[PDB]
Design a protein around this ligand. Structure first.
Ligand SMILES: Nc1ncnc2c1ncn2[C@@H]1O[C@H](COP(=O)(O)OP(=O)(O)OP(=O)(O)O)[C@@H](O)[C@H]1O
Ligand SMILES: [Ca+2]
Ligand SMILES: [Ca+2]
Ligand SMILES: [Ca+2]
Lengths: 127, 368
């Protein structure tokens, strides 16, 4: 009796307006170095939380799970589940979005002021 | 097999049990969900293939019917076999994830939980809906899963990670009904397939040579006129039979249940009906994420046909997408393997401590 994530990254998620990016790495949610934001390994999957300040004092959340063309099934399956978990952790308030390489929404692409970039490669599968 | 604590995953079906280790990409043990007991004497019991092979002296049963457990004593034997004969582990040393059918009865959920902690002494366990685990395995949190196995089919709309229970639909039309129907139409063709051994041969024809036509009537037509698409099949004795339009007439029963004397809607219309019971604002994301799962979705052509049928049911501008992963026989199991391997799953399990405090009814709050 309860079922609450204690992961250190959940404790940082959505604390203030901004952009947070995590990569799936062998069944874990690992922060991306902020200097690397916008560069996506096509062989991987990622979780993106965009936090916006509301006039009301509370925060708006959009959760995007990005799937590279060569990411393995454990990675795209983890990215999705982590997305559900992060939304729950945030009291259901996030709006979830599935982003596929080559087909991302304009809002998502609009988060990367200097233009999202794809690069081949990535971290090996957790299976 | 075993990271720190090694979780296990068991996907119990009406026809097959799929079991293994969290973190692997496939179930290590796949066996028939059958329990055999003596017609007369020796208490004793057999599971799976071994039950089938001594069938002439045993009374064979299926503890799961249409995805639901109907015999707990035989369900315990499947599990005992799973842990000790198939996976070779000590259940008391591993967290166990288990899967259930959509809408599983409340008392069944308790019982499963009770057996794990009291009969097997698992240190921790979890229950997950089969259809939700396939969706996850396809890398999505919103979509509709059409899951069809040996004994039951379901259409399950999911949104932001959870099934929408009011829109789930059940159809007691599946793999076994299909094998039976192929037995009957091959028998009308002029052959004879009526026994148990014959049912097994027929299941194999169904899995090797059957397919779904894109256009039923044009196909019937092409076969009425040409022989080009007929196939041979060698029986276990070396006799060879020829399969004609039975190839596609058997799985046609998924789309036309009247073929089996059933009055229900086919899988395409059941899918449509589930979508239409959901809020209009998510429907677009349902049509755009139709995931097929389970052994009975393995027929060649089924995705195209589902694509066509849904296209014909929905507004012409609706974008339809049928996703049919090559591994969809094991999607449920794989989703479970992914879920239980996550660094964040730790707190999601029901622990022994939580069981000792609330009892079996802990399952209704933890396994949502
Ligand atoms: N290649 C195939 N083509 C068509 N049918 C197949 C194929 N392979 C397996 N099936 C059928 O799939 C069924 C078993 O699939 P599955 O493991 O998904 O069902 P289950 O989980 O045991 O049953 P249920 O989900 O109804 O409880 C059997 O009817 C089997 O004949
Ligand atoms: Ca990768
Ligand atoms: Ca939400
Ligand atoms: Ca099943």
């Amino acid at each position: 009796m309860g079922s609450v994530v204690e992961h250190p990254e959940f404790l940082k998620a959505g604390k203030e307006p901004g952009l947070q990016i995590w990569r799936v790495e062998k069944f874990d949610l690992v922060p991306v170095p902020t200097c690397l934001y916008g560069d996506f390994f096509t062989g991987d999957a990622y979780v993106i939380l965009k936090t916006v300040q509301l006039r009301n004092g509370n925060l708006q959340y959009d959760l995007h799970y990005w799937l590279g063309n060569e990411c393995s099934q454990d990675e795209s399956g983890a990215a999705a589940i982590f997305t559900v978990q992060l939304d729950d952790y945030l009291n259901g308030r996030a709006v979830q979005h599935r982003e596929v390489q080559g087909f991302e929404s304009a809002t998502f692409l609009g988060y990367f002021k200097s233009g999202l970039k794809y690069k081949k490669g990535g971290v090996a599968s957790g299976f | 097999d075993g990271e720190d604590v090694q979780a296990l995953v068991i996907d119990n079906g009406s026809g097959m049990c799929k079991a293994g280790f969290a973190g692997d990409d496939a179930p290590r043990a796949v066996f028939p969900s059958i329990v055999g007991r003596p017609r007369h004497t020796g208490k004793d019991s057999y599971v799976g293939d071994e039950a089938q092979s001594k069938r002439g002296i045993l009374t064979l049963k299926y503890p799961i019917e249409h995805g639901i457990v109907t015999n707990w004593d035989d369900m315990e034997k499947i599990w005992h076999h799973t842990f000790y004969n198939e996976l070779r582990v000590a259940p008391e040393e591993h967290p166990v994830l288990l899967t259930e059918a959509p809408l599983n009865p409340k008392a069944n959920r308790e019982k499963m939980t009770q057996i794990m902690f009291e009969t097997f002494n698992t240190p921790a366990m979890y229950v997950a809906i089969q259809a939700v685990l396939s969706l996850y395995a396809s890398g999505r949190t919103t979509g509709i899963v059409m899951d069809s196995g040996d004994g039951v089919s379901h259409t399950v709309p999911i949104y932001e990670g959870y099934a929408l229970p009011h829109a789930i639909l059940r159809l007691d039309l599946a793999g076994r009904d299909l094998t039976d129907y192929m037995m009957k139409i091959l028998t009308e063709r002029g052959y004879s397939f009526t026994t148990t051994a014959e049912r097994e041969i027929v299941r194999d024809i169904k899995e090797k040579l059957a397919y779904v036509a894109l256009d039923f009537e044009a196909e019937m037509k092409a076969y009425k006129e040409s022989s080009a698409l007929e196939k041979s099949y060698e029986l276990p004795d070396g006799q060879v039979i020829t399969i004609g339009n039975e190839r596609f007439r058997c799985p046609e029963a998924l789309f036309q249940p009247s073929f089996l004397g059933m009055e229900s809607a086919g899988i395409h219309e059941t899918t449509y009906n589930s979508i239409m019971k959901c809020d209009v604002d998510i429907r677009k994301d349902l049509y755009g994420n139709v995931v097929l799962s389970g052994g009975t979705t393995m027929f060649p052509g089924i995705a195209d046909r589902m694509n066509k049928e849904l296209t014909a049911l929905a507004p012409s501008t609706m974008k339809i997408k049928i996703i049919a992963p090559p591994e969809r026989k094991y999607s449920v199991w794989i989703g479970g393997s992914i879920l239980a391997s996550l660094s964040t799953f730790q707190q999601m399990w029901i622990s022994k401590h939580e069981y000792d405090e609330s009892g079996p009814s802990i399952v209704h709050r933890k396994c949502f």
